[PDB]
Design a protein around this ligand. Structure first.
Ligand SMILES: CN1CN([C@@H]2O[C@H](COP(=O)(O)OP(=O)(O)OP(=O)(O)O)[C@@H](O)[C@H]2O)c2nc(N)[nH]c(=O)c21
Lengths: 36, 171
């Protein structure tokens, strides 16, 4: 759903660091509000 | 069932409501804990922003098992980066508090192990947003957090960003 960095955590490459930008953290809220 | 994005740490939201009859420790209320970005927003979406909570209340976000107190072992030798805010926009206050929350859960600071939590105080006259640090005697870590704080929050010049040791604040 969002652009992930190389050393950052993700479902694929789940060894990444659990660190998030402001914009990234903002992208993740939107999945609930937008949907019916 | 979609996968949630896990946070580096587990955080707990505290909510304090002033009461002349009660002691400051009894004013505190533990609300909930979370460890994913989605569960953070779910919480944030249903709680009053700082601009709407009663006069004399506090919101605190601290890592799990760290109470927002000087007395807590994690904060004993620590301090806090205090941001004092004159009577300003409600939107500006809520946005500033949210940005602090996002810095914390996002692990914006290099010395993540140095971060204990953040506290916002609503006092009408002047609102204060503080970020509690583990080791106040280490100027290196304190200042690193200070610059990241000035930058990330985009803090304006002549906005008071001051550090205080908890030992001194007790006076
Ligand atoms: C963080 N605090 C704050 N506090 C009580 O709350 C008072 C501080 O009020 P605040 O919560 O600092 O907001 P403010 O009213 O702005 O502080 P001041 O008015 O001293 O500037 C202290 O006088 C103290 O009695 C505390 N009392 C105990 N025992 N432990 C703590 O960790 C804290």
């Amino acid at each position: 759903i969002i652009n992930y960095n190389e050393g950052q955590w993700s479902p694929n490459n789940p060894s990444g660091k659990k660190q998030y930008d402001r914009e990234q953290l903002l992208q993740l809220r939107e999945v609930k509000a937008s949907r019916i | 069932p979609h996968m949630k994005h896990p946070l580096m740490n587990v955080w707990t939201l505290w909510y304090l409501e002033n009461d002349r009859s009660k002691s400051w420790e009894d004013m505190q209320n533990e609300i909930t804990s979370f460890d994913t970005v989605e569960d953070f927003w779910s919480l944030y979406n249903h709680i009053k922003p700082p601009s709407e909570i009663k006069l004399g209340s506090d919101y605190s976000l601290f890592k799990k098992n760290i109470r927002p107190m000087w007395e807590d072992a994690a904060n004993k030798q620590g301090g806090r980066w205090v941001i004092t805010l004159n009577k300003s926009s409600k939107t500006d206050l809520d946005n500033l508090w949210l940005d602090v929350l996002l810095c914390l859960i996002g692990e914006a600071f290099d010395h993540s192990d140095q971060i204990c939590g953040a506290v916002i105080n609503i006092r009408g006259k002047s609102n204060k947003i503080s970020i509690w640090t583990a080791d106040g005697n280490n100027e290196e870590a304190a200042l690193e957090i200070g610059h990241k704080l000035r930058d990330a929050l985009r803090l304006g010049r002549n906005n008071s960003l001051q550090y205080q040791l908890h030992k001194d604040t007790m006076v």
